[PDB]
Amino acid sequence: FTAVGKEFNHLEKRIENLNKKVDDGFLDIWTYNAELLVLLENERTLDYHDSNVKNLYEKVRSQLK
Amino acid sequence: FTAVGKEFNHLEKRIENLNKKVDDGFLDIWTYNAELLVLLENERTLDYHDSNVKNLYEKVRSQLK
Amino acid sequence: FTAVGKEFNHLEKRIENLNKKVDDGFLDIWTYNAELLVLLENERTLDYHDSNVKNLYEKVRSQLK
């Protein structure tokens, strides 16, 4: 019977809410990383055709899904 | 009686400690983002008066509370 | 008897899996921060000998363990 109890559901929903907080926080971080990168690449600071620069685009792309 | 039991409190405190780890980790990340940004803006790399650059300051400000 | 029950172990393993997700996510973020920084420092954008620039290397080093 524990999975219908109040206490099990309290803890479960706290886990779920933390997992959501982590997902939304990671999305916020990686959206920031994307917004910064594209500005930095607008300069001669970072060149889009350098393979090390493409590595960053590819990570950001993959993180934003 | 479960909320006074040892097991419920063990799990609850693990949740709490994870939530703290997430908060402190996000604060570390966003403090880093702030420290990097202000250095990058010291250059002509990023211009503080560009509206896309202000977007980044505003996100960092909001994240650091 | 609760620590051998199914429900306690279900919640515990969810905590553990979330903690792993957080660790792996933070490592991904800080690896990205390292990869970006070293590219930015390749330019006159950021000078490795400036003490504020060394602060960033030191944080990244410490985060990657």
Side-chain angles (χ1 to χ4, degrees), chain A residues 7-8 10-12 14-15 18 21-22 24-26 28-29 31-33 35-36 39-40 42-43 45, chain B residues 2-3 8 12 15-16 18-19 22-23 26 29-30 33 37 40 45-46 52 55-56 59-60 63:
Chain A
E7 296 83 3
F8 174 95
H10 171 74
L11 294 172
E12 203 190 18
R14 288 173 69 183
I15 299 162
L18 188 49
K21 173 172 178 181
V22 171
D24 288 351
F26 286 167
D28 287 347
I29 283 163
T31 299
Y32 179 92
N33 289 344
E35 294 171 336
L36 177 67
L39 290 167
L40 291 173
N42 281 348
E43 311 295 294
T45 317
Chain B
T2 304
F8 174 95
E12 203 190 18
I15 299 162
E16 287 172 3
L18 188 49
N19 179 67
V22 171
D23 285 346
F26 286 167
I29 283 163
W30 281 100
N33 289 344
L37 178 56
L40 291 173
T45 317
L46 288 180
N52 294 317
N55 162 80
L56 305 172
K59 282 181 159 182
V60 171
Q63 293 279 3

Side-chain angles (χ1 to χ4, degrees), chain B residues 7-8 10-11 14-15 18 21-22 24-26 28-29 31-33 35-36 39-40 42-43 45, chain C residues 2-3 8 12 15-16 18-19 22-23 26 29-30 33 37 45-46 52 55-56 59-60 63:
Chain B
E7 296 83 3
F8 174 95
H10 171 74
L11 294 172
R14 288 173 69 183
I15 299 162
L18 188 49
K21 173 172 178 181
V22 171
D24 288 351
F26 286 167
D28 287 347
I29 283 163
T31 299
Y32 179 92
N33 289 344
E35 294 171 336
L36 177 67
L39 290 167
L40 291 173
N42 281 348
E43 311 295 294
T45 317
Chain C
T2 304
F8 174 95
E12 203 190 18
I15 299 162
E16 287 172 3
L18 188 49
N19 179 67
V22 171
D23 285 346
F26 286 167
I29 283 163
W30 281 100
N33 289 344
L37 178 56
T45 317
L46 288 180
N52 294 317
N55 162 80
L56 305 172
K59 282 181 159 182
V60 171
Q63 293 279 3

